Amino acid sequence: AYHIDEEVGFALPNPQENLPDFYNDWMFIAKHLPDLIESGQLRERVEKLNMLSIDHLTDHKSQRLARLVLGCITMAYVWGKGHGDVRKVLPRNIAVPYCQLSAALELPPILVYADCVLANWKKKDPNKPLTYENMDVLFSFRDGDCSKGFFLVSLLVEIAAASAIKVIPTVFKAMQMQERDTLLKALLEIASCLEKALQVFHQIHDHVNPKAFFSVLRIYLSGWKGNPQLSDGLVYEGFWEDPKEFAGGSAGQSSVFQCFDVLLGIQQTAGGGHAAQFLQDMRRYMPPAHRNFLCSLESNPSVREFVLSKGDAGLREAYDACVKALVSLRSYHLQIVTKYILIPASQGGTDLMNFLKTVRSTTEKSLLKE
């Protein structure tokens, strides 16, 4: 189908953690980024790799892991240590397989949300549940970067939203088959799961430290689109002749908030303003199956139209509980961007907050009763 798992939602079910032995020189660099970066051997070990054919990768999970491996190497190669000493050219022996692999997975050749979160995890013990304490990340950039906390908490917000996403078939079939009671329970279960996803979101304080995120990790997730340090983008040597620009990572790339915008008929990506264009641009950084899923929902009959047309105050309350849990998520998110970015910035990015406030505002405008 749309590669949406019932238990983990948009996340890659049970990611592969090991590559064929043919790729150990890739794997060795990725597993050792904190040391190799700290000493300054990282760029040297990248520039000495042979060119490895990607054709020994033979399933979606092996290719997803290879993309995560090459994507971490690329960020560590471009940004190095984080203090302005960048590289504007990606060596051929990594750029070519990376770009080839990315074309096959239909992703931009830059680290995205779906690599470093949705494929970058493992259970400690496969027979115990998906709790923080039973999980680990597969790669990190620097000692102290809080990558495990940041990646795993984002992942756990995705798994919470999965119990909501599981209900979306029920919504459209209760509409088609005119089943009012069924549609009302469905919307109320969605709001319930959206409310639990927000409480899982509070665990970002438990595991991520603002100074670590702002001054270490944020750097390795940054991109080269409208970035003054790489004003023309990145040359992917041996693959494209001219430098290319791509945006850095963001859970704007998470389909979960865009999922429920489309479902509830909230008019985010409709218009020509800068908030709509960004949200549609971020859809090019999502896995193709998830891109197609969001478009498939966009073409179905409106859930908002249905509830608005049937003079049914219980239905309207259920829809509003959904819009409200969405508004709560984005407001808490505003808070998070204040604690983890704006405050540490002071120790131009005011278009950041104007974007997020416009999206939250548009969301709360869809409420049926103020």
Ligand X SMILES: NS(=O)(=O)NCCNc1nonc1/C(=N/O)Nc1ccc(F)c(Br)c1
Residues that bind ligand HEM (CB under 6 A): 154, 157, 201, 204, 208, 213, 250-252, 254, 257, 330, 333, 336-337, 340-341, 352, 356, 359
> Which residue stretches of 177-287 are H helix?
180-201, 204-207, 210-212, 218-220, 255-263, 274-281
Q: Please, which residue, 43 or 333, has the CB nearer to ligand HEM?
A: 333
**Cβ atoms of residues 40 and 85 within 8 Å:** no
CB of 335 to ligand X, least distance (A): 13
Q: Please, which residue, 90 or 157, has the CB nearer to ligand X?
A: 157
CB of 97 to ligand HEM, least distance (A): 27
Q: Please, which residue, 237 or 364, has the CB nearer to ligand HEM?
A: 364
Residue in 282, 213, 224 with CA at minimum distance from that of residue 77: 224
Q: Please, which residue, 142 or 218, has the CB nearer to ligand X?
A: 218
95 binds, among ligand X, ligand HEM, none (CB under 5 to 8 A by kind): none
Question: Is 202 flagged in the annotation as binding?
Answer: no
CB of 359 to ligand HEM, least distance (A): 4
Q: Which residue's Cβ lies closest to ligand X?
A: 249
Tokens 């069924």 — which residue?
A: 182
Q: Please, which residue, 150 or 239, has the CB nearer to ligand X?
A: 150
| Token code pair at residue 37 | 């970066």
Distances (CA, A) of 348 to 112, 309, 342, 344, 345: 24, 43, 11, 15, 11
367 binds, among ligand X, ligand HEM, none (CB under 5 to 8 A by kind): none
| Residues sharing a CB contact under 8 Å with residue 245, sequence separation 6 or more, in sequence order | 223, 224, 225, 226, 232, 233, 234
121 binds, among ligand X, ligand HEM, none (CB under 5 to 8 A by kind): none
Q: Give me the amino acid identity at 62.
A: S
Q: Are strands 89-90 and 235-236 parallel, antiparallel or unpaired?
A: parallel
Please tell me the distance from the alpha carbon of residue 13 to that of residue 287, in angstroms, as a whole number.
14
**Cβ atoms of residues 222 and 353 within 8 Å:** no
Q: Please, which residue, 130 or 251, has the CB nearer to ligand X?
A: 251
57 binds, among ligand HEM, ligand X, none (CB under 5 to 8 A by kind): none
Please tell me the distance from the alpha carbon of residue 319 to that of residue 307, in angstroms, as a whole number.
8
Q: Give me the amino acid identity at 9.
A: G
* CA of residue 216 relative to chain centroid, distance: 19
| Residues sharing a CB contact under 8 Å with residue 85, sequence separation 6 or more, in sequence order | none
- Integer-rounded Cα radius of gyration of the chain: 21
Please tell me the distance from the alpha carbon of residue 97 to that of residue 329, in angstroms, as a whole number.
38
Q: Please, which residue, 222 or 363, has the CB nearer to ligand X?
A: 222
Q: Which positions touch ligand X (CB under 6 A)?
A: 113, 116-117, 150-151, 154, 218, 221-222, 248-252, 341
330 binds, among ligand X, ligand HEM, none (CB under 5 to 8 A by kind): ligand HEM
287 binds, among ligand HEM, ligand X, none (CB under 5 to 8 A by kind): none
CB of 158 to ligand X, least distance (A): 10
97 binds, among ligand HEM, ligand X, none (CB under 5 to 8 A by kind): none
Residues at the annotated binding site for heme b? 333
Which residue ranges are tagged as binding site? Answer: 333
